[PDB]
């Protein structure tokens, strides 16, 4: 969260997308329900931090692989 | 048993031990030491009498002599402590481990096996 604001601005500046908030269950594996049947998912997910705030892997790492989305991660 | 006046194994080969005061000889003798020191003297006597090299302690002969000295100490202990079940076990186990040493020495070196039996007064017996 020290860098949430910085990362959110970098995404907007490059014309891309940021998710720095609490990651809800099924954003990727249940995207059609949450957003709609025609929702387009990300083609690439870049992790600037791969751990959540309890020192475990971010749930989106596993869920990105489930949806066969390539991940870049520090 | 060696005489009480016998010097300890450590002080027997220091130069000039025969010219020191009598009081100093008593303090370096078996009389002023524990029984374990008397057993080290007994082990040395058997080594020179039996083994070809008295300095080789890892030979099967030396182990049989070392254990035979322990066996005699257990017997003397149990003569006064007849309800000491712990040392009765050590005695019976030690007798069985010497027989296993004597067996392997008889199979490997009979000429030495005979000298060990004569020297230590062991009558080898075949198990039933």
């Amino acid at each position: 969260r020290q860098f949430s604001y910085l990362i959110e601005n970098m995404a907007r500046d490059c014309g891309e997308y940021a998710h720095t908030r609490y990651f809800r269950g099924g954003m990727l594996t249940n995207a059609r329900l949450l957003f709609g049947p025609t929702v387009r998912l990300p083609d690439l997910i870049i992790f600037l931090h791969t751990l959540n705030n309890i020192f475990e892997p971010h749930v989106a790492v596993r869920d990105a692989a489930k949806m066969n989305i390539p991940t870049v991660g520090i | 048993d060696p005489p009480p006046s016998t010097l300890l194994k450590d002080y027997q080969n220091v130069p000039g031990i025969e010219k020191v005061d009598d009081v100093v000889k008593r303090l370096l003798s078996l009389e002023m030491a524990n029984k374990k020191e008397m057993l080290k003297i007994k082990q040395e006597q058997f080594m020179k009498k039996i083994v070809a090299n008295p300095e080789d302690t890892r030979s099967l002969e030396a182990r049989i002599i070392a254990l035979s000295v322990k066996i005699r100490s257990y017997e003397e202990h149990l003569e006064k402590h007849r309800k000491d079940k712990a040392h009765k076990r050590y005695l019976l186990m030690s007798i069985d481990q010497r027989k296993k040493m004597l067996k392997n020495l008889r199979n490997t070196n009979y000429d030495v096996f005979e000298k060990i039996c004569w020297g230590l007064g062991i009558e080898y017996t075949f198990p039933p």
Binding site: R1, Q2, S4, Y5 | -
Partner: protein, 86 residues
Amino acid sequence: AKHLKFIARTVMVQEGNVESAYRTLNRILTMDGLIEDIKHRRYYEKPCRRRQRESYERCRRIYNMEMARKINFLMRKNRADPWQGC
């Protein structure tokens, strides 16, 4: 019985404050383990039960001391949120 008297387990009263003197004495006897010892000596505790109690009390100390160590370690993090809103 054979020792001198008024030396062991003796606390002097200051300015007639008997309440504070008794609390000091009781605190002394507790820290030295005499109170729990006296309590556990009213009825015979059989060895199996004493061994079980000692194990339970020793395992409790380890857990309580390790939980205390973690609380002290994390207490600095109880400060206000530096990134409120993010």
